[PDB]
Amino acid sequence: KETAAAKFERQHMDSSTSAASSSNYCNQMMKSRNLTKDRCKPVNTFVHESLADVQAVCSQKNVACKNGQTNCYQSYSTMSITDCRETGSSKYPNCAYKTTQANKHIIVACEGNPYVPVHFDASV
Ligand SMILES: [Cl-]
Ligand SMILES: [Cl-]
Ligand SMILES: [Cl-]
Ligand SMILES: [Cl-]
Numbered sequence: 001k002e003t004a005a006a007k008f009e010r011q012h013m014d015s016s017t018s019a020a021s022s023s024n025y026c027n028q029m030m031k032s033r034n035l036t037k038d039r040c041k042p043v044n045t046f047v048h049e050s051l052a053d054v055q056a057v058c059s060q061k062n063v064a065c066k067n068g069q070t071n072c073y074q075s076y077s078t079m080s081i082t083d084c085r086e087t088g089s090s091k092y093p094n095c096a097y098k099t100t101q102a103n104k105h106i107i108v109a110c111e112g113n114p115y116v117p118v119h120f121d122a123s124v
Pocket of ligand 4: 050
């Protein structure tokens with residue numbers, strides 16, 4: 001079974017680019033990160049910063065998670081992100097995603113020793 005930290009890295013880190021290149025970014029990345037295997041994952045955010053900068057968020061601003069838990073942290077700085085969301089023309093297989101690039105603070109839930117991101121809660 002994939003660890004929670006590893007799952008977060010696979011689903012949410014893309015340090016290899018500064019920003020989404022084009023409208024096809026999400027179709028490509030959703031497929032390659034194995035987020036369209038049996039079902040199209042409806043919504044997924046990728047962060048275009050180093051792994052270290054995203055891990056560092058777990059020692060930044062402690063804020064409530066949407067679900068009321070208190071292990072969420074909000075990045076002090078904005079980060080380059082891409083939100084990927086299925087479009088109306090999407091139907092498994094042949095998932096289809098809209099790509100929206102933005103520069104926003106991220107909010108992640110953190111757990112473990114080391115205390116690292118295990119869920120992407122939101123962007124602001
Ligand atoms: Cl793994
Ligand atoms: Cl791990
Ligand atoms: Cl997400
Ligand atoms: Cl990097």
